[PDB]
Amino acid sequence: DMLRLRIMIWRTLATDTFDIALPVNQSFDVWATIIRGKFQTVYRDIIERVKS
Amino acid sequence: NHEMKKYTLFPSQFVIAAEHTVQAAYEAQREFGLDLGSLQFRTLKEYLSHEQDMLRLRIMIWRTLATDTFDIALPVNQSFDVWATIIRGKFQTVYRDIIERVKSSGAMGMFAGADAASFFKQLPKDFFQPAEDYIQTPYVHYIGTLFGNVKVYEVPAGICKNLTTENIQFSSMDVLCYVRDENPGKAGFVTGDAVPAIPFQHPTTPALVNRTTLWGSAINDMHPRNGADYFTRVTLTMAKKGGLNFISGDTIDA
Amino acid sequence: CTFIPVTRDQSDIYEVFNVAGSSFGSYAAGDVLDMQSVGVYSQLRRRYVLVASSDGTSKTATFKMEDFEGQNVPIRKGRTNIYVNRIKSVVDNGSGSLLHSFTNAAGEQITVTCSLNYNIGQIALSFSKAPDKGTEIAIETEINIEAAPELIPLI
Amino acid sequence: EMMSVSDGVMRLPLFLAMILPVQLGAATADA
Amino acid sequence: EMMSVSDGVMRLPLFLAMILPVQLGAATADA
What we know:
- The structure is cut from a larger assembly and holds five copies of chain A.
- Helices cover 62% and strands 0% of the residues of chain A.
- The first copy, chain A, is mainly α.
- β1 of chain C pairs parallel with β1 of chain D, so a sheet runs across the interface.
- Chains D, E: It comes from Escherichia phage P1 (Bacteriophage P1).
């Protein structure tokens, strides 16, 4: 299992960055929506590259 | 007094073909069991339609003149309802300009990029109605409707880039708006089929060659009388003081 | 992870790709055609950009199919149009001519005359006076596949 | 070299699977 | 100039539709 994890982490090539610090004057709903949007975009990109 | 004028239309043609040899067909049959004729026929059949649909979009995007700009970044300390109302008002004004120019009425629609669709998917439930059981695909597909009138379609980033490497200009932040008109004499974009595709099968050549051809005629162009006024191109910027960009989730100069 | 049976040391996988057989239009030989493929192919009505940006001092411009295509291509008669600043004009005269006029930015009138050669697809343009600095010219025509039975794309 | 130890035996490739081209299409007929 | 291939025909146009001007008006009688 540890070797599986090592292979998966080592052979990755795609990278992305996203700041996660919560704004001072914002509730959790807006930040959760933004995070959901970002992750949906990431998965859309992975589906587009894979085409499956 | 009064005066008159005239306009004219005419269709175009298309043609495609495919061919293969007997030895290759027999080799494929013996090795893997595949048949070349059916595969080639099917590929031609799908590719003709696919190219026609892509050419339609190329035609629509190439011949627009109207432009508009807007900033989509959220304010740092604002909720989504107010921003959604502002978006709705801006888009209502944009659509009102089209009706003002063409002096008619009809359906409503819009073309959106990947990032624009991603932003639109973040709107509250009453503003945006997602498509039922929608699953993402890398095609040009329908993702739902917003405001209850406008139907939207998402253009993948790869298709946008493949358009951009041509002379056609388009970015993932660009948005195309259009109005479909059903009036008897007035229409924005017209299409039709003068002669459907006619398959042609040729007998085996004395050189042992099998060949198949397709031919037909159709019309795909914009209406000669006041065509392009039905379309506007809207681009969205992502730079304002005290805002957040969902691409990176960072404050902008604040 | 995904589980697959393994019984021997080597295992082979094969796939098939769609390939543009003929080098024509946007595509070339060996290019892959897929879901996101965009380009002109198997379509006869096409448009080309002649001048991206005028120099402000030229009165003539020539369009030859030998540039945007490999060789000479016949053109159907009475099916050509001229775009000036993405504004189209009437179709050409049947025999050999085309007449078009557009308004200058300062408000003057400029006339454009065109001479056509259908056999080799050559069109010559002449202006009454040089256009402005920022101006583009585009030409829309269609290929006379009847005259040339070849050049039909393949897959 | 010798068949007594490993690597000295020839190997038989095995045909596993075949992949066919995916469907093409677009949806721009609304306008 | 042969009739079989169906290009040498002279071809005839069609009427399609007629278009008339829309009505005019304004709503300023409230004041």
